[PDB]
């Protein structure tokens, strides 16, 4: 059945995103079982993103030629098996756990690249959009459920190992159901022209800034709140609250952005970059207040997280509109792929590691006590507002050349034919 295929693939995506953030929710515990520092605890996410980034184009290449059901099932089976077998590593071996993260990255890259094509080819011009929307609205839900599941199982069983064993069972089940309920099924001349398009380049830099901030914050906040609450001498509910909040900010941001853009398109033809830039600057103003409120109050930190969280996600669905506003129809396949790769390279490939590295560098030159353990991370997370302000400036520089770029595109399209 077609509805069964859509439902099973959507559940697969939710399970896909639940398995990236079960490591953040137990980060504090890992740093005691293996005897590492912040430098060592950033690598667990840095290597994951590097492997995913390099794997994705190859699996896109493969998924055109060969059986797709075979490749999806093999990917799910592989990363479920590796995730399960990773929870037995002895204490003396830390590099093995980093290798495990690399392998899980490969396994998820395969599925994330291939599933949208299978959903796309089943449906027609009208109902395809709704099915893709239901597919993509599994990102906030799975992301939050990662924090909640990890912390809850660790709370229940009493040993963080158990947070790495609940998911592989559900992986194995769906890996077999995706074999039963689913029905079967020069790029250089583009690069020489996509680097003279100023709106395209500036939009790509702005999206990279968004990725930097999102990756760093989304890995490091739950631990920083715990350190702050230890300093106040009034203290794993923090990760539960963070998951509950993110589950709803994900949807609210996108609704807000679409509404504002739709209204502003009937006043001028520069609506998309202006809305994006205003949202980025507001989010920077509100983000820079957590690192001040948390020294005094805790509920203020949560409210600031809510507002900045919401305004940082508003430009999620408007960058695709910019890309198809300024690029002619026979270069969009190349443009999307190059943009996504570059977003990962300058984004959160090496962001969490850098935060941890700076925290340790600050702390080695000062007495190591809980106060300075908290203050070092506080003063190392100042780099998120700075790059968000850069992102706002880049969206303004996009809005400066938007119209001339559209005019060039129309001349090319009508000349070619």
């Amino acid at each position, epitope marked *: 059945g077609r509805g069964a295929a859509a439902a099973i693939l959507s559940l697969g995506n939710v399970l896909n995103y639940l398995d990236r953030y079960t490591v953040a929710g137990v980060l504090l515990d890992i740093q005691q079982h293996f005897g590492v520092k912040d430098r060592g605890a950033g690598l667990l996410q840095s290597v994951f993103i590097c492997s995913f980034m390099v794997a994705a184009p190859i699996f896109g290449y493969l998924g055109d030629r060969f059986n797709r059901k075979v490749i999806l099932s093999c990917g799910i089976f592989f990363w479920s098996a590796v995730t399960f077998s990773s929870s037995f590593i002895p204490q003396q071996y830390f590099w093995l756990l980093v290798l495990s993260r690399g392998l899980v990255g490969i396994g998820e890259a395969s599925y994330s690249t291939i599933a949208p094509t299978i959903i796309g080819d089943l449906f027609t*011009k*009208n109902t395809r959009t709704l099915m893709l929307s239901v597919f993509y609205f599994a990102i906030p839900l799975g992301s939050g459920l990662g924090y909640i599941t990890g912390s809850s199982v660790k709370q229940a069983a009493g040993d963080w190992h158990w947070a790495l064993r609940v998911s592989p069972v559900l992986g194995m089940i769906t890996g077999t159901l995706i074999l039963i309920l689913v029905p079967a099924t020069s790029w250089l001349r583009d690069m020489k022209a996509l680097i003279r398009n100023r709106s395209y380049v500036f939009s790509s830099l702005a999206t990279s800034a968004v990725s930097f901030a999102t990756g760093a914050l989304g890995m490091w906040i739950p631990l920083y709140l715990h350190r702050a609450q230890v300093v106040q001498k009034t203290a794993a509910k923090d990760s539960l609250i963070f998951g509950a909040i993110t589950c709803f900010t994900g949807f609210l941001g996108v609704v807000t952005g679409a509404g504002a853009t739709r209204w502003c*398109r*009937l*006043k*001028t*033809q520069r*609506a998309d970059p202006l809305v994006c830039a205003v949202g980025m600057l507001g989010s920077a103003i509100f983000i820079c207040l957590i690192f001040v409120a948390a020294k005094s109050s805790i509920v203020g930190a949560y409210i600031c997280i809510f507002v900045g969280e919401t305004l940082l996600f508003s430009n999620w669905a408007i960058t695709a509109d910019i890309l*198809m*506003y300024v690029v*002619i*129809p026979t270069r969009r396949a190349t443009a999307v792929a190059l943009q996504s790769f570059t977003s990962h390279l300058l984004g959160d490939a090496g962001s969490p590691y850098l935060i941890g590295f700076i925290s340790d560098l600050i702390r080695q030159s000062t007495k190591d006590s809980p106060l300075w353990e908290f203050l070092s991370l506080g003063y190392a997370l100042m780099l998120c507002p700075f790059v968000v302000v850069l992102g706002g400036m880049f969206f303004l520089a996009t809005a400066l050349f938007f*119209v001339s770029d*559209r*005019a060039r*595109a*129309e*001349q090319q*399209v*009508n000349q070619l*034919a």
Partner: nanobody
Amino acid sequence: QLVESGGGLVQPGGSLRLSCAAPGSRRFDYYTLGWFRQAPGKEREGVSCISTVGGITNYADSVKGRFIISRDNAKSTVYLQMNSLEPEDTAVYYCAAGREMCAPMMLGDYYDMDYWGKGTPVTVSS
């Protein structure tokens, strides 16, 4: 919505001029214009379109050399000048606005338009 004006009863060899306007202070300049038609026995088909910045116009194969489309976004209007009408031009004419660029072989596609009008009929007598 958008609003269409004009339309009526003409004789072969006549001429006609239709207009489309946006009531209010709405500007309709992001992308805004094309003209479509529908007849009793058949399916809707694009008749012509005009572009956002340059003033680049496209027509279908059956109306080339007779129709002319033009834009004026100081006052938010668009005009269609029809000439040399013939008994198989009898239909209802519509006005639409979407986002894809202006190109040939984009005319016929009407499943990706943001705003539609309500129609104005033209009858060519004998």
